[PDB]
Amino acid sequence: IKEKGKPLMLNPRTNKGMAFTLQERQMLGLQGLLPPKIETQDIQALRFHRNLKKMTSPLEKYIYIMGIQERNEKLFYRILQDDIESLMPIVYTPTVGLACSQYGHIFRRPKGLFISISDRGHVRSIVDNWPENHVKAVVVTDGERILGLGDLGVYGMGIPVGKLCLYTACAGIRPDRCLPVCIDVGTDNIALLKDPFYMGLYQKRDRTQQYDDLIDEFMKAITDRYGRNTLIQFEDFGNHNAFRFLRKYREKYCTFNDDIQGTAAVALAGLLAAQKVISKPISEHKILFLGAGEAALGIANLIVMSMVENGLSEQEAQKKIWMFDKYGLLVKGRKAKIDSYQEPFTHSAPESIPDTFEDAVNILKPSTIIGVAGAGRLFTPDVIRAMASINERPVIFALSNPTAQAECTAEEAYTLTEGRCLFASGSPFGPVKLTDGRVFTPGQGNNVYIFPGVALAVILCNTRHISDSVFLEAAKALTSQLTDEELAQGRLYPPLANIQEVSINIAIKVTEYLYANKMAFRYPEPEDKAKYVKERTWRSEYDSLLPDVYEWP
């Protein structure tokens, strides 16, 4: 703390509000700049809930709380902490999307770094404009696939912002060690191109080699200022760029892709919980995806990794996996192009080629169904009814976000199958009570349950590169925290209310693995990995800003 006076109030990283003690007020030059009352964070919190309770819409509530992050960081996280479960729908999915598609409308103060293609050749100078000088985690996007909402361009910065928020409020990463980034090379969305409030460059997306040079220049500039092992979580890019950049950097930097690997870990964990109820013989496992993109391909590769670790060869495991997209079932020889990653899951066409998804469900007769198209309610009743007929305890997962692009709802799943299903969603749904009294409390298959804890571990361990096994491990660490009681409620995931510890427990496990596999470079190595982790978490409790004053002998 080298600053004194008003600046201390202007900076939300330090603004305490009326919680500034008199000692600090007088000693740092704030006396007379604050009301003669000294408050506790406890009161400050009470003020918030009292006010939030009166608000009506979620976008209005979202605007409010997010602004607190602009006024008082400590109280901001204190307020989340007070109840992350009831505030997640506002700050995360589904209302976060609504805010992104409104970003230019609700704009008040910016957040994160903004690098546009028109800045190429000077990406370093921009990075040098960032205030915090010890960043450890970056979350970057270009806004081409914001959830299932599509190309939102610069209005997409609300995603990294929202994600980094969860790093801290979930895994205790330090707010000032995070940096959300947005690369603006344009947007193809005709609509924002005509909008006057738009915050980005008014041009279509540039896909020439100039685009790639920029991300190259971006990655270099970042690591130069902050270090080669700076964590870089890629978020919401377009399918080609997602894998493209993943495979191209995963070996040179400490980077990963949330949509591909993050989602893989979560899904495998819910599926793992489910098996605990089904106990369906490996041999008889058939999985069918709705959509074959970033997320589908990712989960598929992790599902395989786990099936392999349980006998089955890599080849025989993939043959148990099918994918259906917007062009239809992925069978060998089809007209619609099949890419490198899809090949292992592209099989020889069956006897009857499914025209509709219900067809594929009826023909392939899968044990599990996973929605990852982000195209809406494609999990029709005829489908859930079919799955209800083919399998006694069918596995239905609808994970597209937000809730509008969700393949189906919790209500539909449990009622259309007579509560014989094992359900999970990407967005939030409340408990469902059947006409006959049975109550089913679904869980939420969101990578929010994974990236905060993984990131922590990777950071604390000074890891230089991330391998997919880490996510496999992570997934194991998560499901391993599920209790048969929570499970006996319809949950394939531990209560959201406990995502804070769950995340910590996750992070503890991952560091054990990282160190055990010689992937961690933090030295020396802690003897008790647990104490180690808990020791370093950030707290929302105010810190004294008083100068170290003492008398000498």
Ligand X SMILES: NC(=O)c1ccc[n+]([C@@H]2O[C@H](COP(=O)([O-])OP(=O)(O)OC[C@H]3O[C@@H](n4cnc5c(N)ncnc54)[C@H](O)[C@@H]3O)[C@@H](O)[C@H]2O)c1
Binding mask 254-273 for Mg ion (x = CB under 5 A): -----x--------------
189 appears as a binding residue in the annotation = no
**Of 120, 174, 286, 464, which one interacts with ligand X (CB under 6 A)?**
174
25, 31 contact by CB (below 8 A): yes
Distance in angstroms (rounded) separating the CA atoms of residues 343 and 346: 5
214, 165 contact by CB (below 8 A): no
520, 514 contact by CB (below 8 A): yes
Binding mask 389-418 for ligand X (x = CB under 6 A): ----------xxx---x-------------
- The radius of gyration of the chain from alpha carbons, rounded to an integer in Å, stands at 24
Residue 125, H or E segment: helix 123-127
**Catalytic annotation on 476?**
no
Residue 264, H or E segment: helix 263-278
- Where the chain is discontinuous (C–N > 2.5 Å), the residues before each break are none
Distance in angstroms (rounded) separating the CA atoms of residues 445 and 369: 14
Please list the residues that pair with 138 across neighbouring strands: 179, 232
The encoded tokens of residue 425 equal 């969603």
- Site for a second copy contains 548 (CB under 8 A): yes
Binding mask 261-280 for ligand X (x = CB under 6 A): --x--x--------------
Closest to ligand MAK by CB, 357 vs 449, is 449
Pairing mode of beta strands 439-440, 443-444: unpaired
Which residue is nearest to Mg ion, using beta carbons?
236
Distance in angstroms (rounded) separating the CA atoms of residues 352 and 355: 9
Pairing mode of beta strands 439-440, 432-433: antiparallel
Catalytic residue among 16, 62, 77, 92: 92
**Of 15, 257, 446, 505, which one interacts with ligand MAK (CB under 6 A)?**
446
Which residues inside 2-31 make contact with a second copy, applying CB under 8 A? Answer: 2-7, 9-11, 17-18, 22-23, 26-31
Distance in angstroms (rounded) separating the CA atoms of residues 110 and 70: 9
- Site for a second copy contains 140 (CB under 8 A): no
Side chain identity, residue 227: G
The encoded tokens of residue 539 equal 């707290």
HSE, CB side, 13 Å, CA atoms: give it for residue 403: 16
Shortest Cβ 461–ligand MAK spacing (Å)? 24
Which residues inside 123-152 make contact with ligand X, applying CB under 6 A? Answer: 133-134, 136, 145, 147-148
The binder of 97, among Mg ion, a second copy, ligand X, none, by C-beta within 5 to 8 A per type, is none
Q: Which residue is it, tokens 């008083």?
A: 546
536 appears as a binding residue in the annotation = no
Which residue is nearest to ligand X, using beta carbons?
293
Distance in angstroms (rounded) separating the CA atoms of residues 447 and 430: 19
The DSSP letter of residue 210 is H
> Euclidean distance between the first and final Cα of the chain, in Å?
27
**Of 298, 426, 428, 490, which one interacts with ligand MAK (CB under 6 A)?**
426
147, 92 contact by CB (below 8 A): no
Which residues inside 328-357 make contact with ligand X, applying CB under 6 A? Answer: none
Binding mask 220-249 for a second copy (x = CB under 8 A): --------x---------------------
Shortest Cβ 264–Mg ion spacing (Å)? 13
199, 107 contact by CB (below 8 A): yes
Binding mask 231-270 for ligand MAK (x = CB under 6 A): ----xx---------------------xx---x-------
The binder of 484, among a second copy, ligand MAK, ligand X, none, by C-beta within 5 to 8 A per type, is none
Q: Tell me the site size for a second copy, rule CB under 8 A.
A: 74
The encoded tokens of residue 200 equal 């980005």
- Site for ligand MAK contains 189 (CB under 6 A): no
Which residues inside 339-378 make contact with ligand MAK, applying CB under 6 A? Answer: none
45 appears as a binding residue in the annotation = no
170-178, 276-284, 344-352, 479-487 -> range binding ligand X (CB under 6 A): 170-178
- Site for ligand X contains 173 (CB under 6 A): yes
For the four alpha carbons of 502, 508, 512 and 515, in that order, the dihedral sign comes to positive
The encoded tokens of residue 131 equal 């205030």
- Site for ligand MAK contains 93 (CB under 6 A): yes
229 appears as a binding residue in the annotation = no
Distance in angstroms (rounded) separating the CA atoms of residues 474 and 451: 9
In whole angstroms, how far apart are CA 546 and each of 5, 23, 25, 43, 549? 13, 7, 9, 22, 8
Catalytic residue among 16, 61, 74, 163: 163
**Of 381, 522, 530, 534, which one interacts with ligand X (CB under 6 A)?**
522
Q: Which residue is it, tokens 């971006």?
A: 218
**Of 8, 98, 138, 157, which one interacts with a second copy (CB under 8 A)?**
157
67-75, 107-115, 172-180, 343-351 -> range binding ligand X (CB under 6 A): 172-180
**Catalytic annotation on 53?**
no
What are the residues binding ligand X (CB under 6 A)? 133-134, 136, 145, 147-148, 172-174, 177, 224-225, 227, 239, 259, 263, 266, 290-296, 325-326, 372-375, 378, 399-401, 405, 426, 445-447, 459-460, 462, 522, 536-538
Binding site feature residues for fumarate: 47, 71
Residues that are catalytic = 92, 163
What are the residues binding ligand MAK (CB under 6 A)? 93, 147, 235-236, 258-259, 263, 401, 426, 446-447
